[PDB]
Amino acid sequence: WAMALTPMEFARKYNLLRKDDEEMTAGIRRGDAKRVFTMQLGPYWDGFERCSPQAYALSAVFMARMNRDRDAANNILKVLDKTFVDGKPDFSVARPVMKKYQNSELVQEVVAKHAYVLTVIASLLEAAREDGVVPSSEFLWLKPVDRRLWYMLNCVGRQTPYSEVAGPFAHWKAEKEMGRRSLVPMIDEAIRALEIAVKEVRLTPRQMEELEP
Amino acid sequence: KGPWAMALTPMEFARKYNLLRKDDALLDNPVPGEEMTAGIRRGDAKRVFTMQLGPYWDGFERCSPQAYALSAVFMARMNRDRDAANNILKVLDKTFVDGKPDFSVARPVMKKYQNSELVQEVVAKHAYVLTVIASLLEAAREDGVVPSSEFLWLKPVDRRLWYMLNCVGRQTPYSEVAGPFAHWKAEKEMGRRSLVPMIDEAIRALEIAVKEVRLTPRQMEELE
């Protein structure tokens, strides 16, 4: 499906550009950007049963790999790949695995330290990678099912996220740096990165004339 | 709807292409076994199935870039160069995350293997791009498993190619590739390539499929 938005396209898509007051450059609406990034953070973690089916199922894959059970992990990934051909993925294949590993030590440690679904599952993926490679390419089907999740998970191991998940990315890294879960959004790093990225791009005269204060 | 839609069932396919009609074989001589069932417009069905066949094979360089690259992957497998095959699959996968795939990555492998004996045997025996590639996939599966999983990304770029390759090893194809599947089988049965479309099995199968679905009274009356 669609390419990830660049910082400028993202800013334009969410009406984040402002007259600043270097030539032919826009500023950012910080309050507005804060809210957009806060919106990207998604739901609080509050038991895996309340996760979307896709986050449920990939969490289970990663829990399996953390607990060194490649077979259970590959069986989910395998069934989801086939069933995806067919038309609708069978997320229920993940239920047995969740039941078995959701209360394991290494998983409880991740859940303890992260307040949002997206930041839990990012750290489950990071931890699963201490066992083996776990590429996005084992779960190609995710992009059309859930774009935000796909982008979050493809940013695990990266320095700089896609703007469309810059919120949950910044929050995730803030939680790791604080050493605790945070329910208060910690997304300021996403704002500063957007401002920097936007000031690098020149606007045309038409685009400058369309800027409001 | 959109690039990710599920495959049409036979009855949905027949409706989409206006292939249903009143069946005058059971109007003129009703069988208890078949009340309330439509017939198929055989001439319109031939056209539609023939339109799914796609272009003649005429040098891999004339193929779509996705058909090009996948052919190269299967070529490499047929020739037992798993590394060259997997590199293409890695690069295609990486590039699909965010932007647009590196199909050019396939060019060295195509250059290398396209005139190989096992590839020349397949190309000799099939007349259409879809039928060539189906047979390259079937041959590449002599080497090892080559699941359609690995080219997940094809579905959005080329719906037809994706369903075609997912029916390799199936006994019954999706209606939307029933034409080239039928033709590919007819080629293997004849033992030569055929430019004349051999899509009769696609029509028979659609007729049979449609006869299994009871219509409502209203639906029977709307039939022409």
Author numbering:
A (entry chain A): 159 to 179, 189 to 380
B (entry chain B): 156 to 379
Provide the authors' own sentences about this structure as they appear in the paper.
Thus, a shorter construct (residues 153–380, referred thereafter as DotM153) was cloned, expressed, and purified. DotM153 crystals however diffracted to 1.8 Å resolution. These crystals contained two molecules in the asymmetric unit. The DotM153 crystal structure is similar to that published by Kwak et al. (PDB entry code 5 × 1U; root mean square deviation (RMSD) in Cα atoms of 0.4 Å) and reveals an all-α-helical fold, comprising 13 α-helices connected by loops, many of them proline-rich. Residues 179–188 in monomer A in the loop connecting helices α1 and α2 were not resolved, indicating flexibility in this region of the protein. The pear-shape structure is formed of a narrower end made by two elongated sequences emanating from both the N- and C-terminal regions of the sequence: α1, α2, and part of the α3 on one side and α13 and α12 on the other. The remaining α-helices (α4 to α11) form a larger compact structure with helices α7, α8, α9, and α10 tightly wrapping around a helical bundle formed by α4, α5, and α6. While the structural homology search and structure-based sequence alignment yielded no clue as to the function of DotM, functional implications could however be derived from a striking feature of the DotM153 structure: its highly charged surface. Indeed, DotM153 contains 33 surface-exposed Lys/Arg and 28 surface-exposed Glu/Asp residues scattered around the entire surface of the protein. Peptides CegC3, Lpg1663, and OSM that contain a Glu-rich motif exhibited high affinity to DotM153 (KD values of 0.19, 0.7, and 0.35 μM, respectively), whereas Lem21 and LegC8 which do not contain C-terminal Glu-rich motifs did not bind.
